[PDB]
């Protein structure tokens, strides 16, 4: 999972 | 959701009976609302005699209830609600969720809550309703029977072995769907549907005080009954090396993997949020690195990736997967275990961890100071996610501050420790998918651990480092050709230019091109051209399309295009080669320049090639013994006699070399080209770029390629080979007819009306037709009316369906009503004038025109197309849609 | 009536060829693409 979306 | 609303105020509550609710008031779009209820029961909670009962209860609660004996969804329909738009439900392993978007928004909130309370507390679950509904559940089940579901069940069986999941698919079995009595549904409902097993969320334009009253009104009286305690959501993890085959006779899957299973929610006494952040950093680092490790793979394995997935509430699977050249599974699993071993021995790249951690900190910084504002649908998305997992929402601003806090406690040492924990998980699994009839014996666990110990003892090189990015640039082109002739078609705004290399330009100065240039380059270099090897030419086209010029790569090609807002694509059909592309007019030299480079300097990206060979080889192995493989062969024999070409054996596939492919491409690139160019610029601006990049490409005359033409006559065949319980009925018919725009238009109209007529004439539901299609066109290249009638249906009366359609075809040319034509002509006129100024249509018609007239006349006088639609013409054409003299019938029945 | 469908996923663009009568995930699985017109996932 992505806790902080970067892209 | 036009003006974003700020972070909402949340109110939560619990009725005396344990019913939980969450009210989320948005400044929000006016009056819009969204209402969800979760019942914490799914197929995992079914008993042995309850296969698919959770999903059946999901259907059945919209039937009779204490207050709506004609059915909850009946009343919903009466009050204007629509199935799937206004109400919906979904059942998965662990929960059943009911979703409502009342058509009149917050004004229907009491109505919605009355409906939901009826479904969840007062459903009758009547046998007579169930016998009506099980036809709808059986359709749901039939449409779920393909190779994708059987392989998904293979994956769950292996990766979730030793758990309740594999034996508890949501849909359940056809036996239980057919045989399970309402009494079983009722006991399940009465076991699980209680208020303390339920929760409700309301989002939108609402007054929390009023909504809490409507919720007390409709749910407070539900009796407080406990549900069984449950602690069976995880696979039973144990130290092991399980070996599984993932297998289906219709799957082209060709793949090895090694998988670690572990408790992923255990944060080891540290911060849960920090833990999840460690997972993101680690997965990003590993994803970066495992891609570089592609350099280490033997020829049998490619595209090694790492994927992490939930396989329970707390268990996760960390897996290394790779694609396998069919027959190379042993070498491929070893190669995968080698790389896993390499990750055990070297720390992750420190700069990667520095960069990734820095990217996250920059986003967490922005989050922490930006006020959160979302559209309505986005609020619903965000909030349902957290609500589905029964967690409170934390706004993005607070979560940015929490990330920054956790990042300060995270150094690369932690990332490495986090990663090595996963790779030390004692519960392990090796998986093999081997396509078709490829010789395969499942390795024993000891054989797999043998390879583990071999690599544990081996000397291994360091992790690959990041390669330098190649920055592509088009070459300089100094040589120029010349235009040698101009033919002018001023009434179509078209000029036709002959070029010194024998190419020609058909240039339409259409204002509709705007500030863009549209290029379609055609030539007679289809893969059936005499000089080419068909399969290799096709592979060559695809490889050059993905690789770009010789000195580039697939990736750098894709970046370069994005930076120039430019597209250009190769498409090699049987009879022609088309390169299509678009660019802003300022990028013209870049569009033409890349075009020329694909022609005289094509590239083959070694990774693209390796990936394409694996794709072709696994498909070859599957097609050699698949149902679809046999159907393709039987349809081909029925319709054409012999295949025009074939794919090679896997052994030949393995031997194909880049120069042999580039040889094929150069054969295709040498056929002379017509450049259909749509651009609103002056000739003086276009001509120098055409002369520099397009007139300088070497060409030799090509021949026209003969079409692959379905044979005349009547032939049929019936094969009982379907693995699903369905019958597929195909019928082909053709009539040679000279193409004209008028004739083509009449065929399409006749086929519209024939579509209606043949669907009512075969509307009887006792025939069992699941899907039906009537296609007919005047194919302009072959100049024949080609008609295609398809059925998918229950097997029993499938042999009657074509007879009835043949029947309906013979009647059609007299049953066509003047009113039928009137509304088609009117509706055609609407679409035609909608196509005025449509670039796609203009482009297509320019190319059709040149194909049939060798000039652009078809761009004018579209207005008198409508005038060719009459009763006498549409009927005269409806008679030619089906030709009994040319009829091929192909029936696939379930296997005996 | 053959068409081509393109898939966008975290690993990259994938392309498969399917008939009109073919469900999209079935054509991918028959092609040996491992996932879970141009559709997004
Ligand atoms: Hg369903
Ligand atoms: Hg009630
Ligand atoms: Hg390209
Ligand atoms: Hg060439
Ligand atoms: Hg053909």
Author numbering:
A (entry chain C): 134 to 140
B (entry chain A): 26 to 921
C (entry chain F): 2 to 37, 86 to 90
Sentences from the paper on this structure:
The study is based on structural and biophysical characterization of a key M16 family protease, FusC, resident inside the bacterial outer membrane. The crystal structure of FusC from Pectobacterium demonstrated the structural characteristics of an M16 protease and further revealed a plausible import mechanism for ferredoxin, an iron-bearing protein from plants. The first of these domains would correspond to the catalytically active β-subunit of MPP, housing the active site residues with a metal ion coordinated by two histidine residues (H80 and H84) and a glutamic acid (E165).
The structure of the FusC:ferredoxin complex was solved using mercury single-wavelength anomalous dispersion (HgSAD) data at 2.3 Å from an ethyl mercury phosphate (C2H5HgPO4)-soaked crystal. The structures of FusC:ferredoxin, FusC:ferredoxin (C2H5HgPO4), and FusC(E83A):ferredoxin were refined to 2.7, 2.3, and 1.9 Å, respectively. In these crystal forms, peptide densities were detected that correspond to the plant ferredoxin. These peptides define two distinct binding sites for ferredoxin in the cavity of the FusC structure. Furthermore, given that residues 86–90 of ferredoxin are capable of interacting with either F1 or F2, these must represent alternative binding events on two different populations of FusC within the crystal lattice.
